[PDB]
Design a binder for this molecule. Structure first.
Ligand SMILES: CCCCCCCCCCCCCCCCCC(=O)OC[C@H](COP(=O)([O-])OCC(O)COP(=O)([O-])OC[C@@H](COC(=O)CCCCCCCCCCCCCCCCC)OC(=O)CCCCCCCCCCCCCCCCC)OC(=O)CCCCCCCCCCCCCCCCC
Ligand SMILES: CCCCCCCCCCCCCCCCCC(=O)OC[C@H](COP(=O)([O-])OCC(O)COP(=O)([O-])OC[C@@H](COC(=O)CCCCCCCCCCCCCCCCC)OC(=O)CCCCCCCCCCCCCCCCC)OC(=O)CCCCCCCCCCCCCCCCC
Ligand SMILES: COC1=C(OC)C(=O)C(C/C=C(\C)CC/C=C(\C)CC/C=C(\C)CC/C=C(\C)CC/C=C(\C)CC/C=C(\C)CC/C=C(\C)CC/C=C(\C)CC/C=C(\C)CCC=C(C)C)=C(C)C1=O
Ligand SMILES: CCCCCCCCCCCCCCCCCC(=O)OC[C@H](COP(=O)(O)OCCN)OC(=O)CCCCCCCCCCCCCCCCC
Ligand SMILES: CCCCCCCCCCCCCCCCCC(=O)OC[C@H](COP(=O)(O)OCCN)OC(=O)CCCCCCCCCCCCCCCCC
Ligand SMILES: CCCCCCCCCCCCCCCCCC(=O)OC[C@H](COP(=O)(O)OCCN)OC(=O)CCCCCCCCCCCCCCCCC
Ligand code: HEC
Ligand code: HEM
Ligand code: HEM
Ligand code: HEM
Ligand code: HEM
Lengths: 74, 379, 237, 379, 239, 74
């Protein structure tokens, strides 16, 4: 498993460019921000609900513990 | 004439290890937590040594020696808090690494996954023992409870308890032997980590897409060396906020009290990285059931490679399974928080429900979801 | 029980530090009030030098106290003036003697209460100032006192910080709050003497990291810019 | 489909290192010591851990801890004396190993030879710290003398000595750091021994004749493995005789007096296995010259592949050179005895001549003689 | 200068597989308790080790309670004095080293928990020492308080003659001859230094037997599995 | 380095017998004792002399030391 015999590929053309000639931060904010928002929207629907369920059970548990450790039936 | 890098034995090993290893280009940030682990381990190997040279593992000087390190030793407090918060960050990185393995289906590399489970076991034992070392009230009482748990095993469970204790209770012999084992074990961790890497190299890392990336591999030396340098430095950022600004933020203040086998502390907990298992422990009323659940909570990672039924090995393209995975993560955090709280209403029922839900997700929801998943995609 | 309140300490800020004049003031609070019954053992007069007292003042303070050490040429304990290296003298030779002198409770080793108690200084300060009268229906065994902030709501402390208890060196009035704040700050320092140095290292680290993250990030992006600009092209026959 | 011995990635190295390793057919017993070292190290690791099980590296309790090991702990005396005599036996096998390397021309293997020199250095340092640990009179005073020897270094002498001491004299800090260093170093020795084996396996082995045995290699498993086991049994015989019939035969009784930094013992002789250098240290009147001679006595092994000039690799066929080598061994024994003896009239001059002749054999006599037989054998 | 070395006495335990006479240990404990314990100490040996070696449990308990040993702070605030029990080490005669030095002429009676494993020569030394007291030779004038013992390094030991004929009455009735007392106390001190002396030797015995059995068979195995190479009988047949 | 890339050899015939038909101790003493005597004869004259001169040096040092520790007329 070293370079030279990984697999077989044909008719692929890859162009590149020296790191000393092209910019290190190309459109970091012009294109970075919309891409970040798109990636956020892609996964927020499947990420948030489990954690907001946690937040709900957390607030309910703390407030119920506070309520239980109180005085009423006497 | 031959290049020394690829001809000298040691240089050949290092070259294949982390110089010219063909690695996928789309390796995300979540793989950095591999190297970071070793880095913390190295730091954990280092700082502990510098702690070990001012620690007298005796129950009459252990706490005094620790105070001596923190107070009357040139830049000793830095070393001590580096050790503690480095343990916290080591477990953070370990949990993130296990999550990465679960998500992107890296358990398909069988031997690496089994070795990882062994590493998790031994490193958690090491951390427990190390936390016993400072000999605070929390240290002593947590040690008593955790070792006493072993009494649940039938017949020979009772005899192991004094054997590990070295006497009839957690006392001189327990502290000294815990120091000895805590010293030796991390080198065993290092050996098992070397074997882990050895096993990983024979197949290569798994890209986020899961599909084999043998047509896109890139050399390690120019690209990932700097990426892991960035990752390690970024981790050091958080570690230095931990040590330098709020060192005792992760740790019960009661530990800063000389251990006294005559006064249980009002609040009893293991460390933040153990509370999750303590939750299942206190969930099962039966003691033997509790110990078996403790073992199973970690060992269930060994069943994960078998339970994988989805035709995709990567979770990038599994929305329902993704929601299940994040529900599992929330379940683990809920277990940790419940372990933090005392066993009262409504924490008891929440703990039972969280334990059942965690086991149910890992064993049943994920495979059934994978099956309906494959049915949904013509395979 | 109620948790401690977030007091706005002068040493509370992220980059803030303690007030060493307040540290000096709280040290005499310990010396003239706590040391009679309380046992601070992990710190020594050597630590006093340079934190709040100069070398000669600390030496004189040490020489004021009498300490028991060393056997003479007759195998006997001999008293001697405290030198710069003696740890703060314990008031009770054995821990059980402390219980015997009081109703049966042990004054904890004040070296670490700021670090040992859940709440830190805010607790102990509220422990001393936040004394009160036992509400109706509450019984209390003779000898115990009522302090809500204490877990269990029944303290064995005689109220020790009563007004005009001492005379501060600089001349600040020794009112309830003033003396309580001084001793609380001194106890915080005794809990961890490296607070000032810790914040100094943190200050250096903040800008060192804020300068290394951008540069290492630029390094990584420059090295990876080869791949971040490849343009694959398929040319099948 | 394929033998697991040569299919499993972990089993590959083990099979190629101990099972199917081509070894010379005419290997004598002098090579068995190569195993005897490694096995012995494990006992030192195995025993040394259990000593660390019950040991408080504190000035006021270290000796008490050792006595409690040898008197109270179940069979603690067995472990303690097994450990000490195992260290002595380890040095016996180390000297025999170096002698074998010198004789049968193994220093032609370069990388293994230098790695072995590093191994020797690390092992001697480890033994020094170990003898420091019991905190007896000889322990403390020998440690003081040997660390004071470092003051001979110009300029940085005193600061380096005070650094190693951890303070102003051998005290709490010195013992506490020595224990941790003694814990870590043997694992460095283990990793370096793995490197030693890795380097050796690439060049096969040197048979007693010295000619290449590439055409008479034999499988390792049915062969020497059993012979190595037999050698290990003989080694166990010697070690068990030493432990069970005279535990303190190789050890000064004065160590059993608790270390008192007020009374200089009548003699400050170090362990038996260091005097050969210590005597050299006594020979040179100059302190810095003494330290340089002491270190160069061990370092001279590195120059050996350079000084060899005889066109025959081995010493099997060089009679005069064999007489020279046995003169060298006699010189080593004489140096050990001289180091044992005090610094008086009859011993000073004997030590001078012993040191001079020991250096002269290695540097001058052996190569000059190696020229002689080459001229004698028409080449 | 000179160092008169102790002649090798033929001790009963000197033998390769010979253990100490435990009755001699019982006798040698009494002399330590009634003579040597007056100024010397055996801090590393407790009454517990005595049982099963030269005393039974009830005698050990009675002997332990014969003396008074200090226990921790009572419920009032001070030391409370209690009779000894099994788990109490041998009482120190002097409160601290300084008291020991001052009480004597200025020297220090070394603890005997290791005096046989610390002195070059062992029992042969101590016995001879206790029996080596004599009038100093002419030309030597020791200071008042110093006593002459050739075996002691420097010949100027600060030890009053510890053993004289009929110093104590042995319970079994053996004569109190100085030689007998010294022999028994030296055996006891050797046992104190090396408590495992019996078992070690016993273990050694077994190691002698089975390794006398394993070594041939393993060798017999080697020649078994190595005979193929030792009977090769090569041959060369070039064209 | 494993078996196969070791050497080139030709016309060498090697016989052998199983360990199960050849006595593991074939005339042990009868041929061993002359063999050991020959081996000792080969090397004694080149091994022993340095050791015996060491013995002489050691004994000589022992007395010379203790004579130096003896008295002296005065
Ligand atoms: C403990 C945790 C911390 C320590 C361990 C860290 C391990 C990973 C560190 C190394 C690593 O993976 O670096 C590459 C990794 C991902 O690639 P990248 O460096 O962003 O390079 C551009 C992407 O390839 C492509 O990203 P893009 O297309 O969105 O464009 C660039 C940029 C867009 O940024 C913005 O738009 C700026 C928003 C403000 O993307 C970002 O995610 C911004 C990262 C910096 C903030 O770096 C980061 O994610 C930032 C640093 C890593 C920690 C996370 C911080 C949040
Ligand atoms: C200190 C650290 C520990 C040192 C010892 C452990 C490391 C070395 C281990 C060497 C080893 O496993 O085998 C060496 C060495 C390898 O040669 P071998 O297997 O004896 O075969 C005979 C030779 O080819 C040489 O044959 P040969 O020409 O002398 O005549 C045949 C045979 C017969 O000669 C004798 O048996 C000598 C006569 C007296 C018996 O020779 C021997 O048996 C020589 C060995 C001494 C007996 O074997 C022994 O030394 C045998 C063990 C000692 C005797 C049996 C004790 C029970
Ligand atoms: C003819 O060559 C050879 C031998 O015997 C003459 C051998 O025995 C062996 C085999 C030797 C060993 C297994 C023991 C020595 C090896 C080491 C100390 C390296 C570390 C590896 C271990 C398994 C031992 C330490 C384990 C743990 C701490 C080798 C390689 C060899 O080359
Ligand atoms: C983006 C937010 C900041 C991230 C961290 C930046 C660290 C310093 C990076 C650097 O050297 O330059 C950053 C920026 C862009 O640099 P670059 O992509 O090389 O383009 C300009 C030169 N041709 O160039 C500059 O900021 C100044 C360039 C002159
Ligand atoms: C970080 C929080 C944000 C996050 O994870 O967002 C989800 C995002 C998805 O990334 P990706 O897999 O590319 O999305 C494919 C969509 N079809 O990113 C991911 O899903 C990547 C992270 C996957 C899980 C990595 C392991 C750590 C998870 C958190 C800790 C869990 C600890 C307990 C479990 C072990
Ligand atoms: C006493 C020390 C020697 C014990 C073994 C006896 C001995 O040295 O026997 C001689 C033996 C001969 O070895 P060999 O290679 O057969 O000699 C051929 C000569 N033409 O000599 C050898 O095999 C030489 C072995 C040298 C290395 C081990 C002994 C020296 C260890 C020094 C430390
Ligand atoms: C004459 C006795 C006495 C005096 C005066 C006294 N204490 Fe105490 N203190 C005690 C005892 C006993 C306890 C433990 C039980 C109580 O209640 C205690 C408890 C404490 C605690 C631990 C509270 C907790 O949460 O358990 C702190 C902190 C403390 N004291 C500090 C002080 C300070 C600061 C002063 C005066 C400036 C002071 N004490 C005066 C005897 C005293
Ligand atoms: C596997 C990596 C390691 C982890 C996760 C780890 C974890 C810990 C933890 C959590 C503590 C308790 C810290 C505290 O309560 O203050 C601790 C203490 C300690 N560890 Fe480790 N440790 C590791 C490696 C080592 C090593 C290799 C050594 C020996 C060289 C060592 C020596 C010590 C010592 C002496 C202490 C007591 C000092 C103290 O607690 O502050 N550790 N360790
Ligand atoms: C002792 C701590 C550990 C160390 C030092 C360690 C080391 C590494 C390293 C450096 C990598 C390569 C980087 C990466 O892919 O993340 C890796 C990969 C891996 N490790 Fe670990 N590991 C540790 C713990 C674990 C654990 C607990 C598991 C899970 C049981 C595990 C399973 C894996 C898997 C499956 C991979 C392959 C990841 C992939 O292919 O994408 N490791 N390990
Ligand atoms: C390289 C192999 C080793 C050598 C040569 C070695 C050598 C020694 C020696 C000569 C002593 C003095 C024993 C005595 O005077 O009674 C000693 C003591 C000690 N060694 Fe080691 N040792 C080794 C490995 C280890 C290891 C790996 C450990 C820890 C796991 C260890 C722990 C100790 C301890 C705790 C002591 C003090 C107790 C004692 O005096 O025996 N040793 N060692
Ligand atoms: C930590 C202690 C050491 C261990 C565990 C060790 C291990 C080994 C082993 C197992 C062998 C193969 C068996 C043999 O040929 O004897 C070997 C060979 C060798 N070792 Fe070492 N060794 C150690 C120390 C040294 C030292 C001190 C030197 C010399 C500086 C050295 C140089 C060599 C050489 C030259 C060989 C090749 C011998 C030959 O095959 O002819 N080693 N070592």
């Amino acid at each position: 498993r070293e370079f030279g015999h990984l697999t077989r590929m044909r008719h692929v053309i890859t162009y590149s460019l020296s790191p000393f000639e092209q910019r290190a931060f190309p459109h970091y904010f012009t294109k970075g921000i919309p891409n970040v928002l798109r990636r956020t929207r892609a996964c927020i629907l499947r990420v948030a609900p489990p954690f907001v369920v946690f937040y709900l059970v957390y607030t309910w548990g703390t407030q119920e513990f506070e309520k239980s450790k109180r005085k009423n039936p006497a | 004439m031959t290049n020394i890098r690829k001809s000298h034995p040691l240089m050949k090993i290092i070259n294949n290890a982390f110089i010219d290893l063909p690695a996928p280009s789309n390796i995300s940030s979540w793989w950095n937590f591999g190297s970071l682990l070793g880095i913390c381990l190295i730091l954990q190997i280092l700082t502990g040594l510098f702690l070990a040279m001012h620690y007298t593992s005796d129950t009459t000087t252990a706490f005094s020696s620790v105070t001596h390190i923190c107070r009357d030793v040139n830049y000793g407090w830095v070393i001590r808090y580096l050790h503690a918060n480095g343990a916290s960050m080591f477990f953070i990185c370990l949990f993130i690494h296990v999550g990465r393995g679960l998500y992107y289906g890296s358990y398909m590399f069988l031997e690496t996954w089994n070795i990882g489970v062994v590493l998790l076991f031994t490193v958690m034992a090491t951390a427990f023992m190390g936390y016993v070392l400072p000999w605070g009230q929390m240290s002593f009482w947590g040690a008593t409870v955790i070792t006493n748990l072993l009494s649940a095993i039938p017949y020979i469970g009772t005899d192991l308890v004094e054997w590990i204790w070295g006497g009839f209770s957690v006392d001189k012999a327990t502290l000294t032997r815990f120091f000895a084992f805590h010293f030796i074990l991390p080198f065993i961790i290092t050996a098992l980590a070397a074997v882990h890497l050895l096993f990983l190299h024979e197949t290569g890392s798994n890209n986020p897409t899961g599909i084999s990336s043998d047509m896109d591999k890139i050399p390690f030396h120019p690209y990932y060396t700097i990426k892991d340098i960035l990752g390690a430095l970024f981790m050091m950022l958080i570690l230095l906020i931990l040590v330098l600004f709020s060192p005792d933020l992760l740790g019960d203040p009661d530990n800063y009290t000389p251990a006294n086998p005559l006064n249980t502390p009002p609040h009893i907990k293991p460390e933040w990285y153990f509370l999750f298992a303590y939750a299942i422990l206190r969930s099962i009323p039966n003691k033997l059931g509790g110990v078996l659940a403790l073992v199973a909570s970690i060992l269930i990672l060994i069943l994960m490679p078998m339970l994988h039924t989805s035709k995709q090995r990567s979770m990038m393209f599994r929305p329902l399974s993704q929601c299940l995975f994040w529900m599992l993560v929330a379940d683990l955090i809920t277990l940790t928080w419940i372990g933090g709280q005392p066993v009262e209403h409504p924490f008891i029922i929440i703990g039972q429900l969280a334990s059942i839900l965690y086991f149910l997700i890992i064993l049943v929801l994920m495979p059934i979801t994978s099956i309906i998943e494959n049915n949904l995609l013509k395979w | 029980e109620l948790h401690a309140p977030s007091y706005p300490w002068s040493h509370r800020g992220l980059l803030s530090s303690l007030d060493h004049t307040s540290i000096r003031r709280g040290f005499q609070v310990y010396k003239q009030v706590c040391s009679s019954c309380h046992s601070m053992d992990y710190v020594a007069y050597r630590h006093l030098v340079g934190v709040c007292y100069t070398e000669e003042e600390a030496k004189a303070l040490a020489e004021e106290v009498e300490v028991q050490d060393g056997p003479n040429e007759d195998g006997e304990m001999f008293m001697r003036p405290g030198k710069l290296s003696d740890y703060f003298p314990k008031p009770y030779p054995n821990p059980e003697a402390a219980r015997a002198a009081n109703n049966g409770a042990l004054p904890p080793d004040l070296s670490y209460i700021v670090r040992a108690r859940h709440g830190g200084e805010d607790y102990v300060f509220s422990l001393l100032t936040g004394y009160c009268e036992p509400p109706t229906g509450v019984s209390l065994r003779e000898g115990l006192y009522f302090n809500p902030y204490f877990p269990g709501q029944a303290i064995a402390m005689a109220p020790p910080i009563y007004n005009e208890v001492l005379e501060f060196d600089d001349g600040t009035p020794a009112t309830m709050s003033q003396v309580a704040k001084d001793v609380c700050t001194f106890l915080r320092w005794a809990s961890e003497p490296e607070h000032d140095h810790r914040k100094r290292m943190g200050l250096k680290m903040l800008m060192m990291m804020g300068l290394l993250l951008p540069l290492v990030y630029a390094m990584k992006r420059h090295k990876w810019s080869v791949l971040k600009s490849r343009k694959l092209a398929y040319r099948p026959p």
